Structure formats: C-alpha cells, structure tokens
Symmetry: C3
Subunit: 114 residues, 3 copies
C-alpha cells in the first residue's frame, strides 16, 4: 500500500515523526501490516485549490483491496484529521484519490503480487 501527500505547506511545518504516524495509523485503519506500507510527503509545492494558495493538499492512497465506499469515507476522515492537526490544512482544501490496484499491476521485488 502507498500514501502520498503533496502540499504547499513548507517542509519546516511537517512534524518530526509524521511519516511514522502515517504508517502506524494507516496500518491500524486498514489492517495492513506496516511492513507493506509506504508513505511519501512532498512539501513546499507550487499549488492552488479553488484559485487560492492557502494551505492545501493533494493525496493518493493506493492499495490492493481495502478500498470501497465506506472504507474510503472512513480513510478520508482519518487522513483529513491528520493533515489538519499536524500540517494545519483545512479539510475542505484536501483532495485524496483512492485507487484499488489489481495485484497484477503492482510490482515489488522482481515480480508482481498476482
């Protein structure tokens, strides 16, 4: 599983420990063991949301399964909550794209997961 956050919040506002927090909370919310979980945060980006350059984030969560209607609602509350508390980004200036990956289309260590 992979979680990516792109944000115009400066690097200095990302707390020490944020990646660890994300890895642990995602493991807890999805049930995936943390060992299979990757996390990627990209600060200081040039972006706009609704024409405004106030703090925002564009994110993506890729997973083989564990994606659907109810789950994604629950992840969006979790992740917007984390972005608001830790990076001070308003939840209405966050988008998160969810991707249910086919195991045949995910490579890892010289093979795929199919």
């Amino acid at each position: 599983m992979m979680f990516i956050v792109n944000t115009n919040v400066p690097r200095a506002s990302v707390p020490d420990g944020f990646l660890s927090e994300l890895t642990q909370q995602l493991a807890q919310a999805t049930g995936k063991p943390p060992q299979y979980i990757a996390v990627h945060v990209v600060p200081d980006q040039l972006m706009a949301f609704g024409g405004s350059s106030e703090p925002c984030a564009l994110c993506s969560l890729h997973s083989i399964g564990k994606i659907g209607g109810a789950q994604n609602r629950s992840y969006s509350k979790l992740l917007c909550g984390l972005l608001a508390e830790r990076l001070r980004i308003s939840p209405d200036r966050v988008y998160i794209n969810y991707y249910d990956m086919n195991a045949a289309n995910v490579g890892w260590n010289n093979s795929t997961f199919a």
Copy 2:
C-alpha cells in the same frame, strides 16, 4: 478536479499567475466551478522525453466525469497551447494522462 504539471522548465520561467490562469481556463473548458479545481506545477524536474532533456512536461487531469474522447482532445489543445505560450514547451514534448475518477474514490472535507 486536479491538474498536475511536472516539467524540467526552471521555476523562474513559470509566469506569475500561471496557476490562476490554469484554474480559470480549466473551469471554462470543463464547466467545473473554479472553487473545485486544484492545480499543481512542479518545475526544475529531472526528466527526459524521447531521450532528450529539452523542455517537456508530464501532466495529469483527474475529474469526476467530464472525461471522454472529444473532451480530452479539446483539453489537450487547450493545455498544450498554454504550456507552449506560457512555458515555451513544444506540444510534441507533452504527455497528459486523463483520469475519470469515481466519486466514491475521491475524498474531500472529511468524507467522499
């Protein structure tokens, strides 16, 4: 809706106002209200297009609907035109990937 541009053009070649321009043009071209449009530009990238390091761009347009055959053609003309006039990138060195997102797979404001 979100539009992302990754390019090897340096930051100083991105005009002031380019993100506002993109937002307004995408609203006009797609009919989405501008308040739902997010834009993201990433300059100074390490990339190659066809083995060459001359100016290029790799882009993505994600939208809940408003994606399809004719529409994507029309967006590619708009967007390549913008990248050419504004960033001086040749249209034959631009790729744009279009994604029709399911509303159930887009989170926003604590929900989907």
Copy 3:
C-alpha cells in the same frame, strides 16, 4: 510510455546517465521506440517504506498497451535490477504501479492518441 521514479536517494547518487539508460532499456524491454518514452526521476524525497527511511522507491509505468500479467512481472525484474545497480535500492523496497492507458486518455501534441 512514461516511467516515474520517486526516491529518497539524494540527487548526487543518481547517475547522470540514468535517465537515458532507463529510456533505452525500456525501449528494448517493451519494443516501444525510445523516442516515445519519457522518464522522470525525483530524488531527495521524504519517504518511508515499512516504517524505515533506508533507500526506497515508489514508481509508475504508464503505457498505451504493453501492460499485462506476464509483461509486468518481466518489467519488475528489469526495473528492480536497474534501481538496485544504479541507485543501490534493495528490490524489496521498490513498488511499481503499472497503468494500461486508453489511447483516448493520453494527450500529446494538441490531441490524443
């Protein structure tokens, strides 16, 4: 075809020829002429893989065709081999997402394919 690598390896550890090597190897592996292949490498990223900040990569390969079960297994070998030799990333710390793109959903040169 486009291939993107995001990694926490610093920019100075990415060999200057890496982008061209990727282009050429992908052309050979997929049969796409190299003039159609774009490559993008993003170093110095803030990332973790399994909670650990040791070298890792998150990658994507997008292509109109040339994507499927067997092909993707083959590309993962090719690309883990390259990342291991050139960026010294362990292959068990690489994810690659593969995307078979509809030609209608790829723009290029003012139109789509």
